[PDB]
């Protein structure tokens, strides 16, 4: 997207050049300020992309740690229901054998 070579009706051989050479010159500046902003962005993007393997981790750790807890927690739950049952026995004998 710029002015095509000799958009001109009348003869402007030298200017045509000088002028086009100038737009092309400052279009190189423009494109450059774009490479600057793109790389400098690509930069703050890499700092973000690095937190990924981290959160990927944090997730995996906690998923595992949870399964481990629940497996234990179920197990306790059983023991608790068991020991609860057994008291109901002993008290239930202190009314009989009081």
């Amino acid at each position: 997207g710029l002015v095509p070579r000799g958009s001109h009706m009348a003869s402007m051989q030298l200017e045509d050049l000088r002028q086009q050479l100038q737009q092309a010159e400052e279009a190189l500046v423009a494109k450059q300020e774009l490479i600057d902003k793109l790389k400098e962005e690509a930069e703050q993007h890499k700092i973000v992309m690095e937190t990924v393997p981290v959160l990927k981790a944090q997730a995996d750790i906690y998923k595992a740690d949870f399964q481990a807890e629940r497996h234990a927690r179920e197990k306790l739950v059983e023991k608790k229901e068991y020991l609860q049952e057994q008291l109901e026995q002993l008290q239930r004998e202190f009314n009989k054998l009081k």
């Binding site: 807890e69 234990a72 306790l76």
Partner: protein
């Protein structure tokens, strides 16, 4: 093997805390290393249910100190989890792997820590 409903009776007696039933079943050949479907042994079971002498008996009859239920838990794991200190000590005495681990990776030290059982830990530190 050739008809393990002896082993069933035994596993059931380890849980119930019935020591004379155990003694009898052993005399009958009952498989000391028998497994319920969840993969338990009698040892596992008496550890679970806090049955000290029963542990001591079974061990004396060559029960594996390091048998693993289906989830990898050993009888140590179970005594650890449940805070059955004395049963832990005899298990260790009898060479339970302190470093052994279920399928979540929890050794028995981990379990102490995770219940924050101050005493079980110190006793678990105390070995090689």
């Amino acid at each position: 093997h050739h008809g393990s409903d002896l082993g069933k009776k035994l596993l059931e007696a380890a849980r119930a805390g019935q020591d004379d039933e155990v003694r009898i079943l052993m005399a009958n050949g009952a498989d000391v290393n028998a497994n319920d479907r969840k993969g338990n042994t009698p040892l596992h079971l008496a550890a679970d249910y806090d049955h000290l002498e029963i542990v001591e008996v079974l061990l004396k009859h060559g029960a594996d100190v390091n048998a693993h239920d289906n989830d990898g838990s050993t009888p140590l794991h179970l005594a650890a989890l449940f805070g059955h200190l004395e049963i832990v000590e005899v298990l260790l005495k009898h060479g339970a792997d302190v470093n052994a681990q279920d399928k979540f990776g929890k050794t028995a030290f981990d379990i102490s820590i995770d219940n924050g059982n101050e005493d079980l830990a110190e006793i678990l530190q105390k070995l090689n």
